[PDB]
Enzyme design. Structure first.
Site, PDB file in Angstrom:
ATOM      1  N   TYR A  32       8.324  -0.978   6.656  1.00 37.03           N
ATOM      2  CA  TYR A  32       7.351  -1.937   7.042  1.00 37.03           C
ATOM      3  C   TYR A  32       7.342  -2.852   5.525  1.00 37.03           C
ATOM      4  CZ  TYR A  32       3.891   0.855   4.668  1.00 37.03           C
ATOM      5  OH  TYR A  32       3.367   1.485   3.696  1.00 37.03           O
ATOM      6  N   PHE A  42       0.852  -7.056   0.614  1.00 37.10           N
ATOM      7  CA  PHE A  42      -0.091  -6.056   0.074  1.00 37.10           C
ATOM      8  C   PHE A  42       0.673  -4.672  -0.184  1.00 37.10           C
ATOM      9  CE2 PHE A  42      -1.438  -6.042   4.390  1.00 37.10           C
ATOM     10  CZ  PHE A  42      -0.967  -4.482   4.796  1.00 37.10           C
ATOM     11  N   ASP A  43       1.813  -4.472   0.631  1.00 34.79           N
ATOM     12  CA  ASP A  43       2.582  -3.105   0.575  1.00 34.79           C
ATOM     13  C   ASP A  43       3.624  -3.273   1.200  1.00 34.79           C
ATOM     14  OD1 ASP A  43       3.132  -0.627  -0.155  1.00 34.79           O
ATOM     15  OD2 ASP A  43       1.912   0.363   1.639  1.00 34.79           O
ATOM     16  N   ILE A  62      -3.667   3.431  11.599  1.00 41.93           N
ATOM     17  CA  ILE A  62      -4.299   2.529  12.073  1.00 41.93           C
ATOM     18  C   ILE A  62      -4.190   2.269  13.513  1.00 41.93           C
ATOM     19  CG2 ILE A  62      -5.137   1.239  10.082  1.00 41.93           C
ATOM     20  CD1 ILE A  62      -3.179  -0.766  10.570  1.00 41.93           C
ATOM     21  N   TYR A  88      -8.588  -2.090   9.241  1.00 39.02           N
ATOM     22  CA  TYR A  88      -9.565  -1.634   8.371  1.00 39.02           C
ATOM     23  C   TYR A  88     -10.885  -2.025   8.531  1.00 39.02           C
ATOM     24  CZ  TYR A  88      -5.244   0.603   6.509  1.00 39.02           C
ATOM     25  OH  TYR A  88      -4.325   1.619   6.216  1.00 39.02           O
ATOM     26  N   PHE A 105       2.195  -6.939   9.928  1.00 37.73           N
ATOM     27  CA  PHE A 105       3.230  -6.084   9.567  1.00 37.73           C
ATOM     28  C   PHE A 105       4.532  -6.322  10.172  1.00 37.73           C
ATOM     29  CE2 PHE A 105      -0.454  -3.402   8.904  1.00 37.73           C
ATOM     30  CZ  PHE A 105      -0.193  -2.618   7.804  1.00 37.73           C
TER      31      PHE A 105
HETATM   32  C1  LIG Z   1      -4.201  11.156   2.623  1.00 37.22           C
HETATM   33  C2  LIG Z   1      -4.222  10.102   1.759  1.00 37.22           C
HETATM   34  C3  LIG Z   1      -2.992   9.287   1.188  1.00 37.22           C
HETATM   35  C4  LIG Z   1      -2.133   9.062   2.375  1.00 37.22           C
HETATM   36  C5  LIG Z   1      -1.018   8.059   1.874  1.00 37.22           C
HETATM   37  C6  LIG Z   1       0.588   8.188   2.503  1.00 37.22           C
HETATM   38  C7  LIG Z   1       0.854   9.362   3.440  1.00 37.22           C
HETATM   39  C8  LIG Z   1       1.332   7.318   2.008  1.00 37.22           C
HETATM   40  C9  LIG Z   1       1.370   6.050   2.936  1.00 37.22           C
HETATM   41  C10 LIG Z   1       2.648   5.368   2.738  1.00 37.22           C
HETATM   42  C11 LIG Z   1       0.229   5.059   3.001  1.00 37.22           C
HETATM   43  C12 LIG Z   1       0.458   3.888   1.711  1.00 37.22           C
HETATM   44  O1  LIG Z   1       0.660   4.539   0.486  1.00 37.22           O
HETATM   45  C13 LIG Z   1       1.414   3.683  -0.577  1.00 37.22           C
HETATM   46  C14 LIG Z   1      -0.599   2.965   1.840  1.00 37.22           C
HETATM   47  O2  LIG Z   1      -0.538   2.074   3.138  1.00 37.22           O
HETATM   48  C15 LIG Z   1      -1.030   0.955   3.277  1.00 37.22           C
HETATM   49  O3  LIG Z   1      -0.527  -0.014   2.110  1.00 37.22           O
HETATM   50  C16 LIG Z   1      -0.450   0.217   4.560  1.00 37.22           C
HETATM   51  O4  LIG Z   1       0.446  -0.919   4.367  1.00 37.22           O
HETATM   52  C17 LIG Z   1      -1.039   0.667   5.723  1.00 37.22           C
HETATM   53  O5  LIG Z   1      -1.985   0.026   6.227  1.00 37.22           O
HETATM   54  N1  LIG Z   1      -0.445   1.696   6.471  1.00 37.22           N
HETATM   55  C18 LIG Z   1       0.592   2.487   6.047  1.00 37.22           C
HETATM   56  C19 LIG Z   1       1.627   2.312   7.082  1.00 37.22           C
HETATM   57  C20 LIG Z   1       1.257   2.875   8.416  1.00 37.22           C
HETATM   58  C21 LIG Z   1      -0.185   1.956   8.820  1.00 37.22           C
HETATM   59  C22 LIG Z   1      -1.207   2.027   7.675  1.00 37.22           C
HETATM   60  C23 LIG Z   1      -1.904   3.218   7.659  1.00 37.22           C
HETATM   61  O6  LIG Z   1      -2.347   3.629   9.094  1.00 37.22           O
HETATM   62  O7  LIG Z   1      -1.926   3.888   6.580  1.00 37.22           O
HETATM   63  C24 LIG Z   1      -2.820   5.196   6.961  1.00 37.22           C
HETATM   64  C25 LIG Z   1      -4.062   4.786   6.359  1.00 37.22           C
HETATM   65  C26 LIG Z   1      -4.301   4.559   5.094  1.00 37.22           C
HETATM   66  C27 LIG Z   1      -5.251   5.250   7.521  1.00 37.22           C
HETATM   67  C28 LIG Z   1      -6.581   5.172   7.211  1.00 37.22           C
HETATM   68  C29 LIG Z   1      -7.114   6.520   7.009  1.00 37.22           C
HETATM   69  C30 LIG Z   1      -8.775   6.405   6.894  1.00 37.22           C
HETATM   70  C31 LIG Z   1      -9.462   5.757   7.841  1.00 37.22           C
HETATM   71  O8  LIG Z   1     -10.768   5.739   7.640  1.00 37.22           O
HETATM   72  C32 LIG Z   1      -8.789   4.350   8.401  1.00 37.22           C
HETATM   73  O9  LIG Z   1      -9.297   3.837   9.439  1.00 37.22           O
HETATM   74  C33 LIG Z   1      -9.605   2.292   9.331  1.00 37.22           C
HETATM   75  C34 LIG Z   1      -7.261   4.552   8.455  1.00 37.22           C
HETATM   76  C35 LIG Z   1      -2.039   6.242   5.871  1.00 37.22           C
HETATM   77  C36 LIG Z   1      -0.681   6.571   6.186  1.00 37.22           C
HETATM   78  C37 LIG Z   1      -2.903   7.662   5.817  1.00 37.22           C
HETATM   79  O10 LIG Z   1      -2.700   8.338   7.323  1.00 37.22           O
HETATM   80  C38 LIG Z   1      -2.367   8.691   4.802  1.00 37.22           C
HETATM   81  C39 LIG Z   1      -2.577   8.383   3.286  1.00 37.22           C
HETATM   82  O11 LIG Z   1      -3.919   7.466   3.377  1.00 37.22           O
HETATM   83  C40 LIG Z   1      -2.611   1.107   3.334  1.00 37.22           C
HETATM   84  C41 LIG Z   1      -3.298   0.152   3.090  1.00 37.22           C
HETATM   85  C42 LIG Z   1      -2.946   2.015   1.916  1.00 37.22           C
HETATM   86  C43 LIG Z   1      -2.030   3.488   1.962  1.00 37.22           C
HETATM   87  O12 LIG Z   1      -2.379   4.104   0.729  1.00 37.22           O
HETATM   88  C44 LIG Z   1      -3.289   4.987   1.075  1.00 37.22           C
END
Ligand SMILES: C=CC[C@@H]1/C=C(\C)C[C@H](C)C[C@H](OC)[C@H]2O[C@@](O)(C(=O)C(=O)N3CCCC[C@H]3C(=O)O[C@H](/C(C)=C/[C@@H]3CC[C@@H](O)[C@H](OC)C3)[C@H](C)[C@@H](O)CC1=O)[C@H](C)C[C@@H]2OC
Length: 113
Positions: A32, A42-43, A62, A88, A105
């Site tokens: 992605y 952003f990523d 998400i 978010y 995305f």
């Molecule tokens: C356990 C901690 C570290 C753990 C980190 C990884 C496994 C590495 C993984 C590649 C994440 C990336 O690390 C480089 C980075 O991806 C982003 O840049 C991004 O593009 C993104 O939006 N993604 C990632 C791809 C799937 C969709 C979405 C996501 O759903 O991500 C999920 C997310 C953040 C969900 C939150 C959870 C809290 C709720 O409150 C909120 O509810 C609104 C939603 C990720 C996969 C979490 O399940 C797992 C984690 O966080 C985020 C902007 C910030 C995130 O870094 C943190």
């Protein structure tokens, strides 16, 4: 543009096999790039050289990903446009996602298990 759950939009960019779709709980492997509405990246999993994996449909990611990814077939490339409440929300994510942001995305579904 297809409008799915939450008002998430799918724009189909290039086709998959049209038959192998992810089901609830399946492990998906995805590349992605994420951008804000103004086009600012952003990523990207591509920049890491490592595809992202999750189980879909169980709240690991998400809401807009749980909505959109099951509608893609293996090999497909699509663009998901995800409103704030399916991303978010009012909180955002520090350094990456502002409050109430619609996220774009570009996703490629590489594999389903
Ligand atoms: C356990 C901690 C570290 C753990 C980190 C990884 C496994 C590495 C993984 C590649 C994440 C990336 O690390 C480089 C980075 O991806 C982003 O840049 C991004 O593009 C993104 O939006 N993604 C990632 C791809 C799937 C969709 C979405 C996501 O759903 O991500 C999920 C997310 C953040 C969900 C939150 C959870 C809290 C709720 O409150 C909120 O509810 C609104 C939603 C990720 C996969 C979490 O399940 C797992 C984690 O966080 C985020 C902007 C910030 C995130 O870094 C943190």
């Amino acid at each position: 543009s297809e409008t799915i759950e939450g008002g998430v939009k799918i724009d189909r960019l290039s086709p998959g096999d049209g038959k192998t779709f992810p089901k609830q709980g399946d492990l998906v492997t995805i590349h992605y790039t994420g951008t804000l509405e103004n086009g600012q990246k952003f990523d990207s999993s591509v920049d890491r050289g490592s595809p992202f994996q999750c189980n879909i449909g169980v709240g690991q990611v998400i809401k807009g990903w749980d909505a959109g990814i099951p509608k893609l077939s293996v090999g497909e490339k699509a663009r998901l446009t995800i409103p704030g409440p399916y991303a978010y929300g009012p909180r955002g994510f520090p350094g990456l996602i502002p409050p109430n942001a619609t996220l774009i995305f570009d996703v490629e579904l590489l594999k389903v298990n």
